[PDB]
Amino acid sequence: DIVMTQSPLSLPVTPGEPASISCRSSQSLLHSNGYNYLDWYLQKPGQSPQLLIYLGSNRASGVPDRFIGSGSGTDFTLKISRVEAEDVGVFYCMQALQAVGFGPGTKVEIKRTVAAPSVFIFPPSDEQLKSGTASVVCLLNNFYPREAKVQWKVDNALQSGNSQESVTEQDSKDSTYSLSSTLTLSKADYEKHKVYACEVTHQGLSSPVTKSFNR
Amino acid sequence: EVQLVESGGGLVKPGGSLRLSCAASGFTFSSYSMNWVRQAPGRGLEWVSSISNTSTYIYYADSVEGRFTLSRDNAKNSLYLQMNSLRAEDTAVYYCARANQHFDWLLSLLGGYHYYGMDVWGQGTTVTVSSASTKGPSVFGTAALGCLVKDYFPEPVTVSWNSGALTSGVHTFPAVLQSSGLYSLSSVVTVPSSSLGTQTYICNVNHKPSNTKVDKRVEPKS
Ligand SMILES: *[C@@H]1O[C@H](CO)[C@@H](O)[C@H](O)[C@H]1NC(C)=O
Ligand SMILES: [Zn+2]
């Protein structure tokens, strides 16, 4: 069987400025019939993918010249000259040789000037607590880049592995992210402590900050 | 419109069954191979089956062989992927796709490079494979708020704010799977202090596979 490989896994790039992706295969790709069996696809965010290249270097109908697409054999490339903000998504090379098999992906996103998050804790609320649970959310707004390190704390005491975190996709206009971090507790150990606080470390911070509440 | 529509989908328990149709209008079906393709939530694109216009050379992914059954009605412009016996990893979204051909010979005994070209795609249909079922309660310069939405199965929920009057500043998060196999998520909204008391907000939640939809007045401290 064949193993499709691409690099990088994420490529934050800047509109105007070009970008390249690599895709490679565990076997060479050409024949049946001369030339290569590799397409490339975008999946713009919240959408079905669409044809981008075909037989390795052919530009499917209604595709900007911004997209050259090259290589042969095992090594391949999707070089986009002058990205525009709408080219965001995942690029998937694909292999047409033995049946069909899809690149692992390369996620394209906009480069942006750092930017710190605002923070916000939320208390359980006596309705959840009536039903016997304690979720304590902690927001992070409109930060870049993605990488953030949110850290929960009960009575000065860290926690480990009781926290799950979601992240919205890049923001379409300001290019930020956001992030929930939820720490769940038994209402019994909720009611038993007073100091709830999350402690964010983003790169756009000269030292961490923490939101805090009591009850 | 040249368009392709998936159908079927829906949740059913493991070792379940489903027949995804996929209808086509706006071109000559018979001129193209067709292809199922899945995306597990979170994961990347994984080809499934292929088939030609002469309704021959059915390929399948190892992950899928012996359980899915690619059919075709060039005279009824449709595509049928019969799914049995469904397991958890089978949970995904399913696109049917246009694809060029380019054939044989030095493939197996006669094979087809089923779709190098792949230019048209339905919207997808979603197939959820797990147990059990049913809804999940909501409960909740700048200052924020939103609602939690929790203990629900299956996906999706549609979180809204005052039915749409808040498009601004709403960060509504991807759903994450709690261990228990029920999801939860939070829908937040960034707002200037000010609004509290005069501006009052309500999160229009709608989970269908449940027959539940609510919304709840957020109002800090009293
Ligand atoms: C099957 O496909 C090829 C081109 O894709 C075409 O030449 C052949 O006639 C097709 N069979 C049909 C349209 O029934
Ligand atoms: Zn925001």
Numbering used by the authors:
A (entry chain L): 1 to 27, 27A, 27B, 27C, 27D, 27E, 28 to 94, 96 to 211
B (entry chain H): 1 to 52, 52A, 53 to 82, 82A, 82B, 82C, 83 to 100, 100A, ...
Q: What do the authors of the reporting publication say about this deposited model?
A:
The HIV-1 envelope glycoprotein trimer (Env), a gp41-gp120 heterodimer, is the only universally exposed viral protein on the surface of HIV-1 and, therefore, the lone target available for recognition by the immune system. Env changes conformation to facilitate viral entry upon binding to CD4 on target T cells. The prototype antibodies for this region include A32 and C11 (14, 15), mAbs that recognize distinct non-overlapping epitopes.
In addition, we also solved the 2.7-Å resolution crystal structure of C11 Fab alone. The CDRs are ordered in the unbound C11 Fab and largely superimposable with the bound C11 Fab conformations, implying that there are only small conformational changes necessary for binding.
